[PDB]
Design an enzyme around this catalytic site. Structure first.
Site, PDB file in Angstrom:
ATOM      1  CB  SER A   1      -0.976  -0.018   1.267  1.00  0.00           C
ATOM      2  OG  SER A   1      -1.594  -1.253   1.244  1.00  0.00           O
TER       3      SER A   1
ATOM      4  NE  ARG B   1       5.472  10.763  -2.538  1.00  0.00           N
ATOM      5  CZ  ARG B   1       4.179  10.519  -1.495  1.00  0.00           C
ATOM      6  NH1 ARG B   1       4.576  10.948  -0.396  1.00  0.00           N
ATOM      7  NH2 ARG B   1       3.149  10.648  -1.910  1.00  0.00           N
TER       8      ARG B   1
ATOM      9  CG  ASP C   1      -4.536  -0.235   1.878  1.00  0.00           C
ATOM     10  OD1 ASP C   1      -4.734   0.207   0.898  1.00  0.00           O
ATOM     11  OD2 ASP C   1      -4.378  -0.006   2.853  1.00  0.00           O
TER      12      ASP C   1
END
Lengths: 474, 480
Positions: free
Chosen positions: A145, A160, A199
């Site tokens: 996630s 990132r 998720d």
């Protein structure tokens, strides 16, 4: 009952009001950002393809999948046994992520992380499936996630690091290959990572599998979203509208009978230019001084449960600079995040007929902040103003998705399900109640809210990942 | 396609429309009937138009942490007799063992002079059969406490005492009226060696549904959620709520003060709202409603509100609509069997038509009508039947919301605290399984005087096992 303090609090509370007009404006801008992000590559949402095109029915059975979840604190590995009839057997193990991965002075590499994950995976199989550890043909779904440039069901590069991770050499690399190579190197080459999932995606699929057939008759899960320390959501978009997808790949799916693909909106980065989102002095101070990634995920920073309590802290510090509020030897100063969203839970619904004891106690436990009754009345007003703004902004992405996909008026008695996980939407008192209010104020109106159902959907990082892997090839 | 038939069906559909103004009128009139019925019965001077509003002597909502030894519960309805054992484990959980047996058709025939001894002797035997099967080793040793769920109007005088007022469902045992049903049941239990089974509580199916919802409502839920109503929407309809003791004027004023001193503030009231507005001063009424009441009802003249919302008559309303269309020679019944077969069209049949998809030429409607009465249909005919069904069910759903809206207004339950949420725990085949029935109830609630703002804070939650867990909770707190 300092009238100067009272007038100051009322004016701060009014800065957090989200009006019906503002909800409409943001809902329209959100749909615009949804469309910009679906164009090939801006001010548009990431709108990242997940390459999941099939919602489970709930009757899939006769298989055991593996699932791994990398979070901000723990790494989980589990086996998911699909029993059909909306049921499953799950065996799981969690182990804390070594703190070296969140500190940047330890020469932490991707091999350090993914080799440790492979070790935990090996430990799990040795404990719960020793007889079949090296022989079984395991299919695994990897729940990751984090911002990921997904290019297929099994391939995506880290954009990132969020959640405080500090592994520099992971950016730009396919995390499925990084994990698979370490799984091979420790003797688990028979464990094939066949799916990279979010998720949010897992929450939607998990609700589709547990949603009864009678329930799913009129109800239909259309969104899987998270409202905890972070925020994000996903929905099913028509293949024709995903213009950033290779047009040849689109035709391949269309001919196979597919019509939609789940999109990871990554709406935590909604309107990062702040062209229309609200912004207070406290929001700017939190972003530029107390955020691990200043400038990113600004929408997230206005709804997430990580910052709600911090917003209050900076409001009381600002009230102390004005000599309107006496901290009286507290420990709020120079202790970021000492006031947590859990602290606010005891203040939100605290009753005034009890002289706000829960509020008094909650503040003493968190920072030894002694309070008077009149001060607690006003602190409660601030908390209730903070949470309502978060709840009202939380409804904007949901309203926008329901409007873009015209999901509410699909059939007589058409009901839609919004699968929700996260500490805030699940446990913060009245948060869902306030979201339903905003939905009724949004362009879908009261008529639409009555047909929307915010249902708590757990097991997204386990059953959801297992479902992504079921249809993929070993 | 027959425009003559279509014009007739559309005009029949408009007769079932319940408007916003009608909901308001009925909601206000319902509150008036609630207040008239809470007053003592000195005479029938406009008080005959009041709801029964029967005190139940249940004054404590379970917390959810109640626990203790296995309790017994018996449930007599209009169709089945249920016996079960309920083990309350605390933390909102329970283990339940139950057995269901249909009431023998011997009780539904009026040419045998069936007596109370026949009924309660049968119940005692079934109870004995249950205990011998699921608790053989301890049938004669334990001091069993039983809660008796009795879904009929009862002039209740305590938690364990109440006299039958009137048999209201499909059978009538005349010598039971005016007698304490707990005593009648206890004596038959004694006569078969179950004197160690003490019937310590007499409860309604509405009361039990409310109590079961109070026990399952989580502690986190209980912060903002509060169960306020227990209602039934099946072959019959009824509901209950908590009224302030000060407002129950029909209660002995000494009993009122005695309970207030014991820390009590409310008592559950069995509204018996199935008999709402039996004078039809404001309820909607079609010719089909009148024909069903006077010709196909076991109790003509009674429970007219029930006959407009209950799932026993919804399908029958359709049958009389199709028969009336055939008398006008607009609809061809062909080789069907709708004539002289009342109730052959059931609410389950209508459930398959409500959400049947027209893009499939309404196949489920075709199949449901062939299976139910060998009625062959064309697509154009099925389109119109679906319209009729949807008109019938929407009226039922809209009227079903009126008593709920009235109770929430009368008790001012919506505006009690910041984030105040209320739960209406409801059981019954219709509210649970009829597609879109609750969705349409939520619509009517938003149209009622509580408005959209109020509906958002109301939660119609399906609550099962109410006639067991609810009875067991009364027996847990009562003395053996």
């Amino acid at each position: 009952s300092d009238p100067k303090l009272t007038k100051a609090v009322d004016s701060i509370c009014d800065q957090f009001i989200v009006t019906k007009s503002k909800i409409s404006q943001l809902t329209e801008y959100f749909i615009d950002c949804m469309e910009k992000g679906l164009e090939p590559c801006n001010k548009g949402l990431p709108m990242i393809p997940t390459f999941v095109t099939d919602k489970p029915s709930g009757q899939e059975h006769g298989v055991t999948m593996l699932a791994a979840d990398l979070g901000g604190t723990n790494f989980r590995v589990c086996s998911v046994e699909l029993l059909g009839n909306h049921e499953f057997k799950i065996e799981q193990e969690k182990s804390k992520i070594p703190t070296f991965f969140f500190q940047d002075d330890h020469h932490v590499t991707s091999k350090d992380l993914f080799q440790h994950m492979a070790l935990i995976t090996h430990q799990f199989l040795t404990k719960h499936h020793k007889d079949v550890i090296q022989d079984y043909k395991w299919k695994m779904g990897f729940t990751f996630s984090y911002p990921v440039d997904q290019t297929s069901l099994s391939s995506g590069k880290l954009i990132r690091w969020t959640k405080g991770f500090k592994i520099g050499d992971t950016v730009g690399q396919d995390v499925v290959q990084l994990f698979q190579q370490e799984l091979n190197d420790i003797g688990l080459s028979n464990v094939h990572v066949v799916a990279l999932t979010n998720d949010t995606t897992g929450t939607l699929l998990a609700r589709c599998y547990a949603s009864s057939d009678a329930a799913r008759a009129i109800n239909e899960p259309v969104i899987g979203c998270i409202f905890g320390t972070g925020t994000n959501g996903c929905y099913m978009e028509k293949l024709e509208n995903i213009h950033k997808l290779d047009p040849a790949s689109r035709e391949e799916l269309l001919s196979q009978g597919k019509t939609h693909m789940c999109i990871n909106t990554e709406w935590g980065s909604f309107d990062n230019e702040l062209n229309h989102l609200p912004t207070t002095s406290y929001d700017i101070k939190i972003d530029q001084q107390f955020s691990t990634n200043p400038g990113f995920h600004l929408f997230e920073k206005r709804v997430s449960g990580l910052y709600l309590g911090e917003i209050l802290r900076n409001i009381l510090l600002d009230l102390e600079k004005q000599e309107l509020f006496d901290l009286k030897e507290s420990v709020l100063k120079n202790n970021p995040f000492i006031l947590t969203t859990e602290t606010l839970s005891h203040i939100e619904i605290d009753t005034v007929e009890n002289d706000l004891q829960d509020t008094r106690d909650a503040l003493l436990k968190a920072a030894d902040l002694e309070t008077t009754f009149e001060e607690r009345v006003l602190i409660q007003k601030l908390v209730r103003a903070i949470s309502r703004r978060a709840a009202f902004l939380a409804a904007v992405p949901i309203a926008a998705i329901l409007i873009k996909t015209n999901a509410l008026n699909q059939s007589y008695h058409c009901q839609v399900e919004v699968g929700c996980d996260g500490s805030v939407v699940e446990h913060y008192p009245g948060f869902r109640s306030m979201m339903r209010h905003a939905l009724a104020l949004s362009p879908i109106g009261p008529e639409g809210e009555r047909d929307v159902h915010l249902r708590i959907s757990k097991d997204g990082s386990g059953v959801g990942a297992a479902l992504c892997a079921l249809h993929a090839n070993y």
